[PDB]
Amino acid sequence: AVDTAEQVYISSLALLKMLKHGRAGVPMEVMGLMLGEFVDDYTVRVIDVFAMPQSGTGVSVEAVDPVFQAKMLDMLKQTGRPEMVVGWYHSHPGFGCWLSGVDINTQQSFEALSERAVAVVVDPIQSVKGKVVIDAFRLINANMMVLGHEPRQTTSNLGHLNKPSIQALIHGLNRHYYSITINYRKNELEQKMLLNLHKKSWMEGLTLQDYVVKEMLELAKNYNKAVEEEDKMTPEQLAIKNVGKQDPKRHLEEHVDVLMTSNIVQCLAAMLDTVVFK
């Protein structure tokens, strides 16, 4: 009939446990179940990613041990909240994160278990601060081959999801697949204090410690002067007949700014004695 533009909120303990779990079992792929809260149609949230046990032979739907389901989920029920699962997670550390055969083998099992039953695809060897490696999907059924494919009532924020046309093999796998919007939403209870942790533990740690210094003199004079003579070679070759010469390259780089930061921070290091001492 009509379907409102969906969203997958995260809690980022989710993403941290994803990277840590795919780091712990890093030469191997893993499988897991995603926990969260079914809020509405146009949004859904993952609030908790919990550990799921290993297989060794094959990652399968039978990695979902139902006695472990009972134990794990009930001991989360007597932990803080009995919230509801919102899907499932896995890894593919061996390649560029597209949908394996096991995923479509368990997709009907999970959409029998869940309403959306959204996948989570990850590669744990990517970057250190930048990449958003996680990938999520929704297999639409082949029974709706008569009707049009992925209506998405507005298809304007879906077009504002459509921005890179990412992962050309998944866009080969556009047969009944599409990625979904995942924002990294705010936690007012957590964001400013994570910022507190981060900044106020990295600005000198206790903020009182270093406010090395006497051999970087020689290191910086080498790193400056040895590049400076080739920085001054090119006015030999500068001339007139404007386009009749072809080698424009700047030379002032890392001898303005490296010397600026170097000498100003080490003259404040020469100021440390008067700052600390009286």
Partner: protein, 286 residues
């Protein structure tokens, strides 16, 4: 027994979510949960942890409740799915400890014979690093009391691990990377001068506590001795550094030589391309 810790922020967020789990219900005092750990050297590491329910009435601070069955069950879970980890202690969210905490400590020092707590703050503004470490050993006393079982403040830090900041620095988004050359030094100046000499002035407020009060452990053992480590510089008037003005000139020496030479070469950097391209643009603009 514990050298220091290497504590990742992930376990702190694993405290934060259970703080969210208790902020919605009747909160009597605080959170007491399990602290797992990866103990390798006398240094310490934590990768993960989980919580345990807890309530506490205040009549004789002895009515306080855990579930060791649930604790060892989920310990068996996370030990099976990860054989690296083991329990290393606990944590609490209220930043000031209380007298029940020794009963908590010694009641969970039976699984592993050490159980280091973690003070945190869910609303931190004034502190430095949230992570704190105590250990329960005895010095017994100078007066040798019957078992003066004391928490002993072990040093601490925020740990570090490769590619655990993938979420973090993408999330926070506001970081001005490499502000060397601008105002980070004076932020450290304001905060270390004011926020360390206020620690000093509250130490002398504790000295006023020793003046008007402070019979208790008045502590003439460690206080003046580490303050004598301070008193390596009794910096009274007349300033006493006639034997250090030439050393300060030696400090000024090399850096000002670098400044003179190098910034003359920096003017020499700017002027060449500035003049040439300047009059290029000027009289070839039309």
């Amino acid at each position: 027994a514990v050298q220091k810790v290497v504590v990742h922020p992930l376990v702190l967020l694993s405290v934060v979510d259970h703080f969210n789990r208790i902020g919605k219900v009747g909160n009597q005092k605080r959170v007491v949960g399990v602290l797992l750990g990866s103990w390798q050297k006398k240094v310490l590491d934590v990768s993960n942890s989980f919580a345990v329910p807890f309530d506490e009435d205040d009549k004789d601070d002895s009515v306080w409740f855990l579930d060791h069955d649930y604790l060892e069950n989920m310990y068996g879970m996370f030990k099976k799915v990860n054989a690296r980890e083991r329990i290393v202690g606990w944590y609490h969210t209220g930043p000031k400890l209380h007298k029940n905490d020794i009963a908590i400590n010694e009641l969970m020092k039976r699984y592993c014979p050490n159980s280091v707590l973690v003070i945190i703050d869910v609303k931190p503004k004034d502190l430095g690093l949230p992570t704190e470490a105590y250990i329960s050993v005895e010095e017994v006393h100078d007066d040798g009391t019957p078992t003066s079982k004391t928490f002993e403040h072990v040093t601490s830090e925020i740990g570090a691990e490769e590619a655990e900041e993938v979420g973090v620095e993408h999330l926070l988004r506001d970081i001005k990377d490499t502000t060397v050359g601008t105002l980070s030094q004076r932020i450290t100046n304001q905060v270390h001068g004011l926020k360390g000499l206020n620690s000093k002035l509250l130490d002398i407020r504790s000295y006023l506590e020793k003046v008007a009060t402070g019979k208790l452990p008045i502590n003439h053992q460690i206080i003046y001795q580490l303050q004598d480590v301070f008193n390596l510089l009794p910096d009274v008037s007349l300033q006493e550094f006639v034997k250090a003005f030439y050393l300060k000139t030696n400090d000024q020496m090399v850096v000002v030589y670098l400044a003179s030479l190098i910034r003359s070469v920096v003017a020499l950097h700017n002027l060449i391309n500035n003049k040439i391209a300047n009059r290029d643009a000027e009289k070839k603009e039309g």
